[PDB]
Amino acid sequence: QDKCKKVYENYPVSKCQLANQCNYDCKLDKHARSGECFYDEKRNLQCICDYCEY
């Protein structure tokens, strides 16, 4: 698979500064493995829920 992390759909960026938020939530709100706030070559942070990444 060319992907193993599902973006927490919407999710008000507001916070997105460190772990916890996306991490914890993903670790349960989406039965994921982990997560964190990330962006692309555009400057847009979102809560990424990781399914396969340690």
Swiss-Prot record:
UniProt cross-references to Gene3D superfamilies, sorted A to Z: Knottin, scorpion toxin-like (3.30.30.10)
UniProt keyword annotation of Disulfide bond present: yes
Source species, domain of life: Eukaryota
GO BP field: defense response to bacterium; defense response to fungus; killing of cells of another organism
GO cellular component, one term: extracellular region
Residues of the signal peptide: none
Alphabetized InterPro entries for the sequence: Scorpion_toxin-like_sf (IPR036574)
Record's subcellular location: Secreted
Purpose of the protein: Taste-modifying protein; sweet-tasting. It is 2000 sweeter than sucrose on a molar basis. Has a pH-specific antimicrobial activity against bacteria (B.subtilis, E.coli and S.aureus) and the fungus C.albicans.
Protein name per its UniProtKB record: Defensin-like protein
